[PDB]
């Protein structure tokens, strides 16, 4: 048979003014001769109807893949509303409810430190810039790098890791031409998280 | 019905002289009235019999959980031998083969930089020490921290992240009493990876 998966809004969507955060009910594994599902959504059990079943797109496993999407208020998600996606299907002898909400636990304000490349790393053509972002709850957050109010292309962020004190940390690495870090050039780590002021801070980092 | 999961040896096991690296065939979801499985193992298809079905231990889902374990040569794994765990079960109308070997691709020697805590982090009681370990392949690796030839207890390592250039990176964070980092005290990041010399390097980091 099948199995149902539920996914939460994106950090940036819920912590930014004019975005469109949404929850995404992914039904995977559907049998051809019975490929019709049926979604009924609920916010805190209260049945809401901003549904959006995006018609049934195809796959490889000789099976199938139906998906709904429910737009939702940012302050809704942040205030811990529960979002029950109720799948009703013919081929199943029972629906498959799957609830999910924000993570409860006390929010925690991330500390952000930016870290210059190790003296040794100069021997290369491109150098690494490190953003440490520790001690935060819940795990949802969003990191980004820029310079001159312009995004940077070459950075990659580790996913959050459960720290020893039940909070999270993570690093985001930025890579640049060694020439740039030298000169004087200034670069910024931007973090977006619940527990932050205006949900947003930004630490710079450069050369002395 | 069920589903089968296969897991590879641990990094340290295969890159260290006298360890006992093993592959672990985890059969999850077993029916009570038909809870008997059968494993037949193969190294590169050649059937080997260092099997080890650890009798069937229990669970919660009103289902079931049978497991085998096959010891194996370190240089075997590192040389890309393929390890087919063949599950034969009654309740299934077909076995469930699941192959897995080392990751193919050209091994790549990790660069290791250690990073002191950001000037601002001194306002706290405990300080963070960073190990950057980048540009390596395959993803298997093992990090560890110590001081005075003694392990440290408070560190946590991110899992490897796919970098832009098809290699991996990761950081390992070590936490210490601010008092220690000060003094003069020296700390070491220890890395164990295929592409390394003797499969092992270790960079130190301290105060000037
Ligand atoms: C054949 O049918 C389908 C078709 O899939 C096709 O074949 C497979 C093999 C792949 O090659 C596909 O590329 C290909 O299209 C197969 O369907 C798959 O089914 C498996 C399970 O049977 C699913 O694995 C799950 O993955 C989720 C999260 O995965 C995201 O990223 C995956 C890529 O790695 C991607 O596959 C998923 O679609 C999903 O996609 C994400 O979608 C959102 C949309 O906005 C996006 O933001 C993401 O970026 C996007 N990612 C991508 C790349 O698309 C994983 O979380 C599930 O496991 C969780 O839950 C399990 C318990 O239910 C638990 O055991 C796990 O440990 C894990 O637990 C989670 O842990 C963390 C907390 O730290 C957190 O993630 C969760 O909160 C927590 N969950 C819970 C509730 O505990 C799960 O493993 C795939 O989703 C699915 N593939 C696709 C594309 O849907 C299927 O394999 C075949 N049929 C079979 C079984 O024979
Ligand atoms: C009855 O209960 C048990 C309890 O399990 C869980 O318990 C509760 C608390 C919740 O978390 C529930 O989500 C869940 O019920 C269920 O047993 C579970 O079975 C599910 C699905 O059958 C498993 O999900 C998979 O997890 C594996 C990894 O599992 C390791 O790590 C887990 C968390 O980190 C841990 O819980 C496991 O114990 C296990 O631990 C490892 O064990 C070995 C043994 O020695 C050890 O050596 C390792 O060191 C150790 N790992 C460590 C360090 O933690 C994961 O691999 C699977 O994800 C891949 O496959 C999915 C297939 O569905 C796919 O959806 C994913 O996207 C993902 O994709 C893979 O990507 C890799 C990339 O390299 C690739 O190699 C694979 O080919 C590819 N696989 C694909 C696509 O198929 C998967 O998420 C649970 O782990 C397992 N739980 C336990 C306790 O074992 C059981 O299902 C329940 N009955 C039901 C629901 O019917």
Curated annotation (Swiss-Prot), chains A, B:
Keywords: Adaptive immunity, Cell membrane, Chromosomal rearrangement, Disulfide bond, Glycoprotein, Immunity, Immunoglobulin, Immunoglobulin domain, Membrane, Secreted, Transmembrane, Transmembrane helix
Effect listed in the UniProt record for changing residue 122 to M: In IMGT allele IGHG1*03
Domain Ig-like: start-end pairs: 2-101, 110-206
Region CH3: start-end pairs: 105-208
GO CC annotation terms, alphabetical: blood microparticle; extracellular exosome; extracellular region; extracellular space; IgG immunoglobulin complex; immunoglobulin complex, circulating; plasma membrane
Effect of residue 86 to A: Does not affect binding to FCGR1A. Only slightly affects binding to FCGR2A and FCGR3A. Impairs binding to complement component C1q. Impairs complement-dependent cytotoxicity
Protein origin, superkingdom: Eukaryota
Residues the record marks as carrying a glycan: 61
PTM comment text: Glycosylation on Asn-61 is required for interaction with Fc receptors and ability to activate the complement pathway. (Microbial infection) Deglycosylation on Asn-61 by S.pyogenes EndoS or Endos2 endoglucosidases prevents interaction between immunoglobulin-gamma (IgG) and Fc receptors, impairing ability to activate the complement pathway.
GO molecular function: antigen binding; Fc-gamma receptor I complex binding; immunoglobulin receptor binding
Region of interest: CH2: 1-104
Cystine bridges: 25-85, 131-189
Role summary: Constant region of immunoglobulin heavy chains. Immunoglobulins, also known as antibodies, are membrane-bound or secreted glycoproteins produced by B lymphocytes. In the recognition phase of humoral immunity, the membrane-bound immunoglobulins serve as receptors which, upon binding of a specific antigen, trigger the clonal expansion and differentiation of B lymphocytes into immunoglobulins-secreting plasma cells. Secreted immunoglobulins mediate the effector phase of humoral immunity, which results in the elimination of bound antigens.
Disease (UniProt): Multiple myeloma: A malignant tumor of plasma cells usually arising in the bone marrow and characterized by diffuse involvement of the skeletal system, hyperglobulinemia, Bence-Jones proteinuria and anemia. Complications of multiple myeloma are bone pain, hypercalcemia, renal failure and spinal cord compression. The aberrant antibodies that are produced lead to impaired humoral immunity and patients have a high prevalence of infection. Amyloidosis may develop in some patients.
Record's subunit section: Immunoglobulins are composed of two identical heavy chains and two identical light chains; disulfide-linked. Interacts with FCGR1A; this interaction mediates IgG effector functions on monocytes. Interacts with FCGR2A and FCGR3A.
UniProt name for this protein: Immunoglobulin heavy constant gamma 1
Species, as recorded: Homo sapiens
Residues of the full protein shown: 120 to 327 of 399
């Amino acid at each position: 048979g099948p199995s149902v998966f539920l996914f939460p809004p994106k950090p940036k969507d819920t912590l930014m003014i004019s975005r469109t955060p949404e929850v995404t009910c992914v039904v995977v594994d559907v049998s051809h001769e019975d490929p019709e599902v049926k979604f009924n959504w609920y916010v805190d059990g209260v049945e809401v109807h901003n549904a959006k079943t995006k018609p049934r797109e195809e796959q490889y496993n000789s099976t199938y893949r139906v998906v709904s999407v429910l737009t939702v208020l940012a302050q809704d998600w942040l205030n811990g509303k529960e979002y029950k996606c109720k799948v009703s299907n013919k081929a199943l002898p029972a629906p498959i409810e799957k609830t999910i909400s924000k993570a409860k636990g006390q929010p925690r304000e991330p500390q952000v430190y930016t870290l210059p490349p190790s003296r040794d790393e100069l021997t290369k053509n491109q150098v690494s810039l490190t953003c440490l972002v520790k001690g935060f709850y819940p795990s949802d957050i969003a990191v980004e790098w820029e310079s001159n109010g312009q995004p940077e292309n070459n950075y990659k962020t580790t996913p959050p890791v459960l720290d020893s004190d039940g909070s999270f940390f993570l690093y985001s690495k930025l890579t640049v031409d060694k020439s740039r870090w030298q000169q004087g050039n200034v670069f910024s780590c931007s973090v977006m998280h619940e527990a932050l002021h205006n949900h947003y801070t930004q630490k710079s980092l450069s050369l002395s």
